[PDB]
Amino acid sequence: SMQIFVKTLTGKTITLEVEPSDTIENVKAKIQDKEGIPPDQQRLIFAGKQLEDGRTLSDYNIQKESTLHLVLRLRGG
Amino acid sequence: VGLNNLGNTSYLNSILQVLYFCPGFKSGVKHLFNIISRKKYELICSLQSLIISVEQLQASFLLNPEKYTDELATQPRRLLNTLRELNPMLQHDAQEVLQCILGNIQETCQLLKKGFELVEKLFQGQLVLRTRCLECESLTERREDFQDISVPVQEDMKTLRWAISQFASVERIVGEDKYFCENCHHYTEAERSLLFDKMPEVITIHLKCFAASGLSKINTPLLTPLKLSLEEWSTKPTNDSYGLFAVVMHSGITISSGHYTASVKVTKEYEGKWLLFDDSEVKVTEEKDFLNSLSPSTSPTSTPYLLFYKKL
Ligand SMILES: Cc1cnc(-c2ccccc2C(C)C)nc1NCc1ccc(-n2ccnn2)cc1
Numbered sequence A: 001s002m003q004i005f006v007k008t009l010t011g012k013t014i015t016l017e018v019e020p021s022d023t024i025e026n027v028k029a030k031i032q033d034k035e036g037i038p039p040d041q042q043r044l045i046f047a048g049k050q051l052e053d054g055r056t057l058s059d060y061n062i063q064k065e066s067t068l069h070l071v072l073r074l075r076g077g
Numbered sequence B: 001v002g003l004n005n006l007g008n009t010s011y012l013n014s015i016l017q018v019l020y021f022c023p024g025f026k027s028g029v030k031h032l033f034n035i036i037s038r039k040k041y042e043l044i045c046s047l048q049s050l051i052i053s054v055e056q057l058q059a060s061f062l063l064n065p066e067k068y069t070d071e072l073a074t075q076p077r078r079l080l081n082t083l084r085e086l087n088p089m090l091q092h093d094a095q096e097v098l099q100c101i102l103g104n105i106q107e108t109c110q111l112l113k114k115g116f117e118l119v120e121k122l123f124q125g126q127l128v129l130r131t132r133c134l135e136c137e138s139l140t141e142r143r144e145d146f147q148d149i150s151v152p153v154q155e156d157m158k159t160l161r162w163a164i165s166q167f168a169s170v171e172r173i174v175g176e177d178k179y180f181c182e183n184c185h186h187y188t189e190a191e192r193s194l195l196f197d198k199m200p201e202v203i204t205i206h207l208k209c210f211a212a213s214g215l216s217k218i219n220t221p222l223l224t225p226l227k228l229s230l231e232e233w234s235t236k237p238t239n240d241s242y243g244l245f246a247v248v249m250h251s252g253i254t255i256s257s258g259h260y261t262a263s264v265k266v267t268k269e270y271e272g273k274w275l276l277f278d279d280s281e282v283k284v285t286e287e288k289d290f291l292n293s294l295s296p297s298t299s300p301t302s303t304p305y306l307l308f309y310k311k312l
């Protein structure tokens, strides 16, 4: 329905075709198809807020040219 | 000593060590704590207890170093209890912990409002994202807030300026990532560029020191400068420059486990030095010596992960 941008790990921007009703886990599955990163290892940041699983894109007011930032988890302890 | 258990929450400790030395963060926490006290909220209450605990330790460290070691071991259980309550999260990501703490404080401020803008004034900026269709050359703009800047560390010795250019310079999206232009009603190649409009007091650089082929950690750091200017990617000409004051590093060969350490700058004799926090150990360091340790030419074992720059 709308086409959003994702900035990948190397800074390169890819495009995704999504719905406002799309869940976050659905978007992570779409990113895995283009980047090869499992959804459990993905973190998506929109406007400074991490997107939590189970919510939809409409919950975060994500519009057409919205940009998601893709980062991983660097675990430590 | 008995403070050895500090290591387990090194993801939280590094973030709280950075926030303690941020300019205006502990003043903002006290202001919120005062408001909540006469309002009669646990995040603010436990943060103020932590700040007072560290303030007592810091004061003792300055005045009587011999009794600092005694007082640090006198009541270590008290310090460890407030960190268990303050933990917003296993081994975790330091940037994710910082995002949780700053989000919790922001929600408290918004609910208290209905001085209250601690997070927004300190860590929140505004981006202008431009897209230019290469067929019709029409410009579309998006405005998005940001709290930290995620830059790459390798191309797929490099400086931080190269990394920000990969973030904000004009990028051409082609091939499988063609932009859909509403004006053309067609898929077209486009150029995307990011610009900084509103500038927070503290600039956080999130270094993507990790890659995918399968996920691996990149151990080579960038050439981190002491001075940072964002005029190259700003909407308006600004003479404001930024100075490095805190670094969070990750030690480990993998992304699934490791250790977090934080280096902060004192802003007396200690003013102008760098404090290296390693679990229960604190070392005072010269600015010249710390910057050499950051050099990728020396192959550091601690990989810089978060850089913090304050407006000058
Ligand atoms: C051993 C230790 C480890 N972490 C922290 C710490 C610091 C800030 C925020 C939170 C923490 C912990 C509790 C999560 N504090 C420590 N020790 C106290 C201390 C503090 C300041 C200095 N210092 C020297 C020159 N200016 N300040 C020297 C010693």
Ligand SMILES: [Zn+2]
Residues within 6 Å of the ligand: B133, B134, B135, B136, B137, B138, B181, B182, B183, B184, B188
């Ligand atoms: Zn067009």
